[PDB]
Homo-oligomer: A and B are copies of this chain.
Amino acid sequence: PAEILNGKEISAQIRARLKNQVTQLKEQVPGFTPRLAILQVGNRDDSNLYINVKLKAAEEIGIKATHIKLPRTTTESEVMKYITSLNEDSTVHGFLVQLPLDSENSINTEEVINAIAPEKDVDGLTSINAGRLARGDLNDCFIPCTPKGCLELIKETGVPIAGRHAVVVGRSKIVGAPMHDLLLWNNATVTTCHSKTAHLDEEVNKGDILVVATGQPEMVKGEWIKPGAIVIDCGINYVPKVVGDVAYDEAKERASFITPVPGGVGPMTVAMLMQSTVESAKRFLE
């Protein structure tokens, strides 16, 4: 049986560290707090929940986090007025737009995301930041939070990455594609799969490291896992109960390490957002 990567536990350690950093930062420079702003369009149930989790992690740490919720009938111009405003407000060190937008009108997600100043793009979602990570310039940029938490979960096994074959399943802007670059520049040989991959099961079996962000409940079967694989599950799926993208029961019999859902990648994502936010508050002082 595989060792559980206790995400709920591991993130607590990160947030406690982040708190001591923030508390020390207000005692070293008095009258200064990290300031985060999350922008939301519409009223998605899952978005409302994830936003609240992040607000809570920010309260516990010492981060002043605002939440702005625009209605569904919001126009793309209206959302730019908020982005413009947050870019130019020097008290705001990082901000993010929760995705996907829930708007009845037609909003160019890319145009909006890309109006964020790269030095506040704590979610690593601008083309500017994506281009650095996509080209290996990893200390110049914000790296998306879920890949960030995923990488830390991998290192917690102590198995070196470099020289190992990693299979990423899914190529999305927020998880799969940045996940691919992080593994590649940690010198894994990486294979990206997506919805058009033939013989997905044969590919998955090649993975020493296996990261799954498909949004397809328990679609990756345990028989597919390479024996002894490190298995990272990003899935959050609400079913007749919360499951992930990997069939957790069968896969734990073949993995050497596995993330549970919930309690795995989830808390790790929120912690790395908190970390990135602190990191941009420091860079602001310099």
Of the candidate stretches A97-105, A125-133, A145-153, A274-282, the one touching chain B is A125-133
Choose from B129, B181, B197 the contact partner of A189 (Cβ within 8 Å): B197
Q: Are B196 and A163 in contact (CB under 8 A)?
A: yes
Report the minimal beta-carbon distance from A232 to chain B, rounded to whole angstroms: 18
The complex is assembled from copies of this chain, and their number is 2
Kindly list chain B residues whose C-beta atoms are within 8 Å of the C-beta of A189.
Answer: 191-194, 196-198, 203
Q: Which residue of B lies closest to A188 (CB)?
A: B196
User: Once the chains are docked, how many angstroms separate the CA of A126 from the CA of B131?
Assistant: 8
Kindly list chain B residues whose C-beta atoms are within 8 Å of the C-beta of A191.
Answer: 189-192
Q: Are A132 and B136 in contact (CB under 8 A)?
A: no
User: Once the chains are docked, how many angstroms separate the CA of A69 from the CA of B180?
Assistant: 38
Kindly list chain B residues whose C-beta atoms are within 8 Å of the C-beta of A190.
Answer: 191-192
Choose among A110, A130, A131, A181 the residue with the greatest number of B CB atoms under 10 Å from its CB: A131
Choose from B126, B128, B192 the contact partner of A184 (Cβ within 8 Å): B192
Kindly list chain B residues whose C-beta atoms are within 8 Å of the C-beta of A192.
Answer: 180, 184, 189-191
Q: Would you list the 9 A-B pairs with minimal beta carbon distance, nearest first?
A: A131-B131, A134-B134, A130-B131, A127-B131, A187-B196, A191-B191, A189-B197, A163-B198, A135-B173
27 A–B contacts, CB within 8 A, in A order: A110-B137, A110-B140, A126-B131, A127-B127, A127-B128, A127-B135, A128-B128, A128-B131, A130-B132, A130-B134, A130-B135, A131-B131, A131-B134, A134-B134, A134-B177, A136-B171, A136-B177, A171-B184, A184-B194, A187-B196, A189-B191, A189-B194, A189-B196, A189-B197, A189-B198, A189-B203, A190-B192
